[PDB]
Ligand binder design. Sequence first.
Ligand SMILES: Nc1ncnc2c1ncn2[C@@H]1O[C@H](COP(=O)(O)OP(=O)(O)O)[C@@H](O)[C@H]1O
Ligand SMILES: Nc1ncnc2c1ncn2[C@@H]1O[C@H](COP(=O)(O)OP(=O)(O)O)[C@@H](O)[C@H]1O
Ligand SMILES: [Mg+2]
Ligand SMILES: [Mg+2]
Lengths: 220, 220
Amino acid sequence: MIVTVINQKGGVGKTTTSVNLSYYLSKEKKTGLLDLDPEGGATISYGMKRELKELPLGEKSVNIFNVEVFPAHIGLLKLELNGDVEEISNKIKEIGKQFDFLVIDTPPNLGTLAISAMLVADRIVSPVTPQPLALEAIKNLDSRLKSIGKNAYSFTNFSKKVVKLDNLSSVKFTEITIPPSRLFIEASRLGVPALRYEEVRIKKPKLANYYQQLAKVISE
Amino acid sequence: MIVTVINQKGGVGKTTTSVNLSYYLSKEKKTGLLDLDPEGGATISYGMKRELKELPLGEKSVNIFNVEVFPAHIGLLKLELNGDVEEISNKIKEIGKQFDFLVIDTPPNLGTLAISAMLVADRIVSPVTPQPLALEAIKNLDSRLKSIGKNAYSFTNFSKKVVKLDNLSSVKFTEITIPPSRLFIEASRLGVPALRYEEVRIKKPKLANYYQQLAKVISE
Ligand SMILES: Nc1ncnc2c1ncn2[C@@H]1O[C@H](COP(=O)(O)OP(=O)(O)O)[C@@H](O)[C@H]1O
Ligand SMILES: Nc1ncnc2c1ncn2[C@@H]1O[C@H](COP(=O)(O)OP(=O)(O)O)[C@@H](O)[C@H]1O
Ligand SMILES: [Mg+2]
Ligand SMILES: [Mg+2]
């Protein structure tokens, strides 16, 4: 199953979602994490660096913290500029064939890499926040989803209360809401997944429940 | 400079020393960490797994937490059994040529891999503890060092007080002593270097001083 995480708006928690969902799924599934953002947030979140090499898409991967991570590289930039959407899509499908779950992190846009990941996604996930900018972004994503005949799941981040915009018929907003937590900040400063950091940092871990619910929602 | 960490006695802190010294040196130097222990403690300490592949020595490396780590693999086992010491030594020298510092973690013995790493080491480091078993081990290491015409530095771990056995003329015991700290246990449970974990876990980091002093001692 290919799970593509999408949002025009930066800073909503796309990389956090990709990193921790892939880590959670890896506990029982052969899980891969494909970093399509040239800035490489997920790659850094697994303790690695962006490759200053124009790599072919999906050639290089490392098993870090139980996840097969494909690090970001400067080649993505060229793929963002000259990339042929059909080739990138077929390459992503071929990469996804070798995993039970392939979670894809995307740049903060609906550009070449993001739309290629969307077109072949088995599931599309878009985090949202109560901030007006994120609501506008999810409206635009609903329009694009209709443009490609697909649907997406959404969950709320940075909040105690769920977001549900019923007029976006292509977006299924779940009842999952992730509140602010400095665990995410500390774990991102380490460059480790927040779930794993919590598994040693606090007596009674809590963040795993949200990603369990997200995995259950998309697995249906 | 090739820095080889050596001890017959398991559990003295060899892997901890290798991991954190390489992480500290990486802050300003191109630093590599070669895991020659088939059990792969250092590899796990950088969030990776032992490769169930009979790899050639030094072919595979990943930059994790700023350190170029060569993960352990089952091939080491065969190298422990059939390894030709001259070839392993020359391969280690060739690997070390490409780093400002190459820190080598070794199995808990003086076997093929350990002696090969010792023969080409620019510096040899052996942690010791006040436990009688470790004192016996460092005596034996002094004998072997004389057998190959080399010297080593030693520092004390798991203790508030320095160990200094003046009859071991091939071992320079430093005044460095590392006390018990649950930071090491927590960081090893994450699979991250203890220095990096401390850099986010406590307000005023302390462990970096010991590795600064060790680096200063060996750099002379
Ligand atoms: N629930 C949360 N509570 C606190 N901080 C968070 C939360 N979710 C994400 N963050 C932090 O917000 C920052 C941006 O998140 P990120 O996943 O990089 O957003 P995006 O990938 O959408 O740009 C990161 O430093 C991350 O640690
Ligand atoms: N100063 C210390 N305080 C507390 N625990 C330590 C200290 N040094 C090492 N340890 C712990 O002891 C265990 C064994 O250390 P390790 O470096 O694996 O020994 P070796 O590699 O010599 O077998 C590890 O779990 C490590 O976290
Ligand atoms: Mg991001
Ligand atoms: Mg060890």
